[PDB]
Every structure is written in C-alpha cells, then in structure tokens.
C-alpha cells in the first residue's frame with residue numbers, strides 16, 4: 238500500500254522501503270535495513286509505505302535529527318492509546334528523566350548485578366542438562382521480566398499476569414486491545430503506587446511514587462505512566478537483542494572461542510554486538526517546515542530515524558557487517574541519542590554481559606539446531622522469531 242506522494246517530495250528521493258516487511262528480510266534484518274545504505278541511495282529518502290514518511294539512512298543525519306528536538310518532535314514517535322512517560326515529551330522531560338535515573342542508574346545496576354547473575358545462573362542450569370532449548374522462549378523471555386520484578390520489588394507470583402499484559406501490548410493474541418492491556422497494567426500499578434506513596438521502600442516504584450515534578454508531588458497518573466515505561470522499555474529490546482547475539486555466537490565458533498579463551502573481552506564484545514545487532518527504529522514528527530541537508534521537510538511529516546542504522550553505516554565503522562571485538566572505536570546509537578537516550582542502557586548492558594559470561598562458562602559449545610533457518614522480524618523493535626539451540630550436555634559445567 239503506497240500512500241499518495243506529497244507534492245513537496247521530489248520523485249528522485251523516493252525509495253519504497255517497508256519497515257515492517259523489508260525486502261529480503263530472509264537475509265537477516267540488519268542486512269535488510271542496510272539496503273538503505275547502498276551507494277545509489279540518498280542520505281534522506283521518502284517511502285510511500287506505512288502512510289508515507291522520510292527515512293534518514295546515515296548516522297550523521299540520524300544523530301543530527303535526534304539532537305534537533307525543536308524541529309524533530311517526539312509527540313508522534315511511531316510510524317505509523319499510547320501515553321507512557323517520558324517518551325512523547327520534548328523542563329518536564331529533564332525532571333522525569335532525572336527521577337527515572339534515580340531508579341535505573343549505574344549505582345542501582347551495580348547493587349543489582351549479583352542478583353541478575355543468580356537469576357541467569359538458575360535459568361541456564363535449568364536448561365543445561367537438556368542439550369537443547371529455544372533460547373528466545375526459554376531464556377530470553379523470562380529474564381528481563383524477572384529483572385523488572387527485582388528492580389520494582391514485586392512478587393514472583395505476579396509474573397504470569399504482568400507478562401501477559403506486556404505481551405498483549407506488542408504481540409496481541411486478540412484477547413485485549415492495546416488500550417485494554419494498558420489500562421489493566423494501570424489497574425495493577427495504581428494500588429501499589431498508592432500503597433508505596435504512604436509506606437515507601439527503596440524499590441523503583443517507591444522511588445517513583447515519592448518523586449517531585451515542578452515543585453509538587455508526582456501525580457498518580459504521572460507515576461503509573463513512568464512505571465509502565467520502565468516495565469515495557471526493557472522487555473522486547475533485551476529479549477530480541479540477546480537472541481541476535483546468541484544466534485551470532487551459535488553460528489560463529491571462532492568468535493565464541495575468543496570469548497571462552499579471553500572472558501575479559503566480554504564487555505567490549507557486548508558493545509560490538511550492540512553495534513552489529515542494533516534493533517530499534519524510532520521516529521519524530523516535523524514541528525515546522527524545515528530544510529534539512531538540502532531536502533524540504535513539511536510541518537507534520539513523519540521521519541523515521543533508525544537507531545539501528547548509525548552503527549551499520551560504513552561512514553561510522555569500517556567493514557560494518559563484520560564483527561570485531563577488538564574495534565578501537567565502536568560507534569553506534571543503539572540506545573538512541575539526544576534527550577531521549579535510553580534510561581535503561583546501564584541495566585541492559587549488565588543483563589547482556591552477565592548472560593554471556595554465565596552462558597559461555599556453563600554451555601561453552603552450542604550450535605543452531607540442524608535444519609533450522611532462523612527467521613527475523615522487522616519493525617520498531619526488530620527481533621528473532623525463535624532460536625533453537627543444541628549442545629552436548631557432557632561438554633557443560635554443572636552449578
């Protein structure tokens with residue numbers, strides 16, 4: 238479905254890329270997006286897919302647009318009932334982020350690290366003697382939701398229902414509309430926020446519920462909308478990213494062996510994997526008519542600014558599809574750039590590093606299940622549909 242081409246858009250800039258179903262997704266999702274960086278493709282193009290929108294294809298422009306919040310607004314960040322905070326905001330933004338940093342900043346992640354390891358260990362040990370798993374379902378999906386319950390001081394018994402609600406927001410089975418799933422999340426959070434307003438702990442919800450905004454107490458509406466984002470922001474991104482990384486390690490024994498031999502390289506490897514298997518593609522909306530790098534943008538045009546593409550740009554990193562854990566400068570915008578830079582980036586890195594450290598020492602040798610062709614999916618958060626892995630349980634190390 239190709240939306241009618243707006244009069245202000247010149248035909249030479251038209252490239253009908255579909256962010257939800259790119260051509261040759263079969264070759265890998267990053268590769269599918271990287272078509273936008275072929276030499277015949279301009280730095281800024283218009284697609285008639287998905288309502289019609291601009292796409293910045295190079296890291297320079299992606300970074301610039303994210304820095305220029307006055308022209309490129311977050312009021313409409315998705316192509317093509319959402320009310321989470323502080324996503325859709327462009328003074329308030331700063332205070333909400335400051336409050337979120339209080340609950341997921343480095344000192345919190347540092348305190349949580351060993352608990353993250355103990356969770357990783359328990360999951361891996363549960364899988365280890367089987368000699369197979371679907372990594373995405375059996376390790377990746379249960380992990381970040383459990384980390385959120387730790388962060389937010391919520392009981393383990395609440396996981397199935399909360400997981401169901403967040404699953405309906407991104408992959409509905411039809412039982413709930415997005416609005417219904419969101420409201421049920423709020424029905425869950427509201428009593429807890431109220432309770433911890435009056436009797437706080439040191440968990441994330443307690444800290445949020447007692448925050449201040451513009452010199453007055455954070456409202457219940459503001460607090461639930463922040464807690465909601467802290468929950469959903471760290472689920473599909475981590476699930477899918479872990480899956481891309483493990484798929485790669487399964488298919489590249491030489492890279493796997495490098496991390497087995499030199500575990501001290503795992504933090505640097507994490508960063509290089511974040512670049513190579515970057516997965517988010519958000520956008521902005523034009524606040525006014527604006528000429529950007531020789532291209533006339535119109536007030537209200539949407540522009541896709543794919544975080545994924547900056548680090549894949551050969552102008553930012555040489556031989557960008559190659560994975561090299563020793564890169565001296567790993568340039569990427571995997572966690573975003575500018576005023577909405579991911580608040581969960583420190584927690585996410587710790588989850589990744591802990592996962593790789595524990596998997597590589599317990600199950601150092603694993604492969605893709607023979608005959609399986611790994612399928613990717615594309616959209617705002619690109620991903621791995623399933624990741625069937627196999628290993629010999631006699632090569633593994635028991636707890």
Ligand code: HEM
Pocket residue numbers: 314322323324325334337341466467468470471472474475478516517519520544570571572573574576577578579580581582584585
């Ligand atoms: C590999 C994992 C992750 C990736 C790649 C990722 C990526 C991103 C990106 C690109 C943005 C900016 C979106 C934009 O500018 O439009 C963002 C924002 C955000 N992230 Fe993450 N994220 C990850 C993990 C997490 C985790 C674990 C959490 C929570 C614990 C989290 C919470 C948030 C929140 C609350 C925002 C909104 C920030 C704002 O608007 O001020 N993320 N993330």
